[PDB]
């Protein structure tokens, strides 16, 4: 904050900073272009929307809380599952997550709109804090103002070590690997569509070094080739070749596997950047994890629950500015179905450790004491 | 991309007098009139300025092309260049408005190229393709040529004279071995 | 300290020592450039921010309201994901504190390190830090007790003022992994394979074919001989024509095993095992419960116990009582295979009494 | 010597990706002579049918009419993978052999000498960590004690160090199951305060 | 990099009186000069043929190397090999107004690679849109008697075949022929790369 | 590294009298003046002292080089050496200060090399490259040569005399088979 004045005047105060130059293009050719970048986001975005939340303020009693009434249906025509999959679907895609809030009544705003991060730009302002966000659709600005207490936009950032105002978006980190997987799939699509293999060639040199065959001869040559020598029903006709004629059989020397092992290795680096295990989305390869009780438990612990615990941490601080009391939203880590093998060995350790009493092991497992 | 020349070479700049001193002088008989000899030197200059992409008499060209290659480039094909005259930039009908700034001619025998200042080069209108008039070549006379290139013109124009149709007859520094160092050596057959 | 008067006058008193020149050219090519260097930092920084902390040295485990809410912007975990994201990238973590109050400062700001340099001064510890963005400096002061910047270093054996940052150690394997993925990216974008070639020599040694013949030759090649619907048309080659089919002999695997070895020597430097991020290869660890336990013991809990110990000393300059602050290494889900065999070891040791095994596990005896 | 093989075989591949020329082919134009360049009107025509129709992933397999003089000679790249790959990993392991780490600990690929990380991490704190730390603390035990009259002995704990748990299990399972001696006699074998 | 020459060979320095004695033309006639415009016309066509195969200069005329950007950091090899006494290194700007600079450049004389070799770790900086003209006199000697005689014999063996056959007519080369004498004066370079 | 010679050979040391006794004597006619013959022996000495890296008349050289190869070496290229005169070590401008100790000339037909005493060789200033003047060659006269090397000069200078341009005509001990044992045989194309 004391350093805020020299970092804000460097880029230019009061004017918009547009951010990355190709996040609007990587959505077209890296999320709607290949299946692996498509599935890796939709697997994470539909998993973070699945996990419930806990609203706690020193007694955790708030299961009828207005924020949990707000998040259950944010706005008309977009549920709780459709809100977070559209919010996480902006964080994984452009590194920035946004939420408009409209509030007629000055507390607990009525609607939450996931503003897309393609058309949003920051205003770095005076003291190193972004004063405005500009929603630029067409050639038209909006300029939300955050020189107040509610500050109508929470700005969920991923970690970016170079930029001061945006995030890094793992699609942008694997953008070279998206271009290998998009092009090695278009290599095979092209090769099946414009390539010429002949099954052979019937050489007619003639009495000279060069000679075409007559049009009465050409209809005769096709008719004994069309009727007697082609098809599956004519595989192996012994083909009398008189003087001049010759049948030179052609081949197709790379048949399978055109960039096949560099496409699957490029498919895995797409799955490595977003953080899914390859057994989850279905990439063939070596079985790193064993039996889906590990990989789905490694999925909700390395790339889902670290992501959801900071989206809900920004929702815990931005919403609480709308209602006096501070709110803490965090994921449940209980009755989430992929952490069952974590929950078994917790209940089997404390269940079999019969040296302590029953009312002392209910509080270790998280039960209401009796 | 057309590259027609503005004016042909006059013939009074070609050495029709020095060619017959190569042709029959010192050894021989002191045969044909000047119009027969001059039809063979420019038929041998145009065979070597096509194989080596040169100009040799320094006449004026006009390169009219429809799209630049890069924005800091468009190498010119005729190799020894000097004093690009004008960069006319016509529109459709063409009131024919020239530009006078933005580019620098870089005289270089390797890549005679036009290399605009900075990063932006003068763009082209829709339909109004840009023309470049430049004066490429070694010198205005014949005495300004490299002598090995001027000898291979005489070794070839004495071939077109002393044997008429495509008949029969390689020496160490022949016709081919003299113009093999003025040819353009490029190994880009690619996209850029 | 006695040797402080001799190393600072040789390094240059009262001046800013800049240090690494490529501290930012490795970030944009090794963190936003390749996914292995991207994932390995984001794997650790999200993990060290996830382990909770406990307040010892108070004689009972309780500034915990400061760390859970440092400022208006980044959250508790957002603070450590940015702090460890500078130590793993540039070897240096910086922490501005603003303190209008005399003790327990209000906000903690992770000052990024590539725009930050030390000045040694006359003796020992650095006198100031210069946050130089644009051309503008700031010149913090360390000539006092509260010392507004904590400077967390990784181990550097030759330098006296900075860290080594494992990205600098794996700087070749980042360039082998970037270029080999740019090899295959380029090779799909500028490479001519033909499916064959129709050679028309002619009656001479050379001859082009007329435009009435070339439009005929395209039409019978386009309609009849190309596509998936035309695989095998027996292609009557007349006098002079010839079809020479070309191949494409190196098809798969252009720098494939040199890239996978480069993709693992990036993971070797940051300390992640190759099972966690997804590197294919041999099975070193078996079943992820020992691969996650090796992660939180070899490269996470050694990293977070050095950052939390530097938070423990620097924050205890603001409040009078010295505080200790170390990771809990319990209620962390990766050490459960470490924990249950401990509970099975002394739990089945039936010789010692019930009050004597609650003290071994960290349970309050009743 | 093994650091210089691993530093250079990694710089072999860094160099080979950075300054090496593979072409995907070559389009030979000899001409009517033995040697002939093509005209500048011909050269822009040759690139434009090569740039637009014959390169890229979208043009993999165009049948490429080659008229008289022209020829397409496809080039290769005959060592593709594995430039000093098995002498770099063998040089990576000798670096790990000198300091004394097991290669499964730092992550070198190779044969699994140790089994399941309860062995290798127990072999790590017994062959190259605890022999090193017991003599650093032995010099600290003798140098510090010269500052305070009484002699001091610092040594590592070998208790609640988390990699020696499989060593500590079979100690507690041997003396725990050996029920012939009494309880106060097996507390002193395990290192417990007697009761 | 243009590399045009300032002045040419004057013609009085070429050994026409010795090349006439090489051709075995005729000794004591009253004519004796009917080919002085011809014997000199093939000496200039065989010197300039060997200057293109060997990149030598042979008469030590004055050259001018007009270029726009330094090739490497400091060295700047010159094409013509036998160099001596670089006359002026001028550093032009956008329009005329050339200012000569002593510039800390020094010219290592060597017939292997004749280069400039900046001594202040950088060559003097070129202005944006400005040239650099290196004026130098490169060659063996001012007269014909200062040449290496094996190279001067290859000029007479070659200019006598331009005399004795006028059009391109095909002619087994002798042990030390024309090509075998200039092949130790050629440039032996094996770098096709970026540095 | 230049290696220009100090003084050329005078011609009164070349055997223009003994060459015509090879050329037409015993078999033939007892043709050309001495200036025509002497232009062919030194054109045949310089063809063999370039192929075999020799000197043959023992004139004085000056080797001026800018960096030593090793610190106990710098082999000299002209092979039969004797009596390195001076090791001048100029500075920039060059008041031209010689050194007189530290090195030993090792006369050897294989590697004529300069081999400083101990392990340190005289270093070079910045800009002031070191020059070596040495007198390499067999003998001051023509009668001090190896006779097979002196015969291959006569077999080659009689070739340059008896056939003028590059025309047509291998014997057991020819020109090539006589100078193949005076050539330098090296198989280091490497770093040191």
Author numbering:
A (entry chain A): 24 to 393
B (entry chain C), F (entry chain C): 1 to 30, 33 to 171, 175 to 197
C (entry chain B): 24 to 85, 90 to 393
D (entry chain A): 199 to 393
E (entry chain D): 1 to 171, 174 to 197
Question: Can you quote the paper on this entry?
Answer:
Gene transfer agents (GTAs) are DNA-containing phage-like particles produced by some species of bacteria and archaea. The genes encoding proteins that form Rhodobacter capsulatus GTA particles (RcGTA) are derived from phage DNA, which has been integrated into the bacterial genome. Here, we use cryo-electron microscopy (cryo-EM) to determine the structures of RcGTA before and after DNA ejection, and to visualize the interactions of RcGTA with R. capsulatus cells. Particles of RcGTA have heads with a diameter of 38-nm and 49-nm long tails.
The dodecamer of the adaptor proteins provides the binding site for a hexamer of stopper proteins, resulting in a symmetry mismatch between the two complexes. Adaptor loops from two neighboring adaptor proteins differ in their conformations and interact with one subunit of stopper protein. A hexamer of RcGTA stopper proteins (Rcc01689, g7) binds to the adaptor complex. Each 112-residue-long stopper protein interacts with adaptor loops from two neighboring adaptor proteins. At the distal interface, the long and insertion loops and C-terminus of the stopper protein bind to a terminator protein. However, the long loop of the RcGTA stopper protein interacts with the tail terminator protein and does not block the central tail channel. A hexamer of tail terminator proteins (Rcc01690, g8) binds to the distal interface of the stopper proteins. Unlike other tail proteins of RcGTA, the tail terminator protein contains α-helices 1 and 2 in its N-terminus. α-helix 1 binds to the insertion loop of the stopper protein and α-helix 2 interacts with α-helix 3 from the same tail terminator protein. The insertion and short loops of the tail terminator protein interact with the long and insertion loops of the stopper protein.
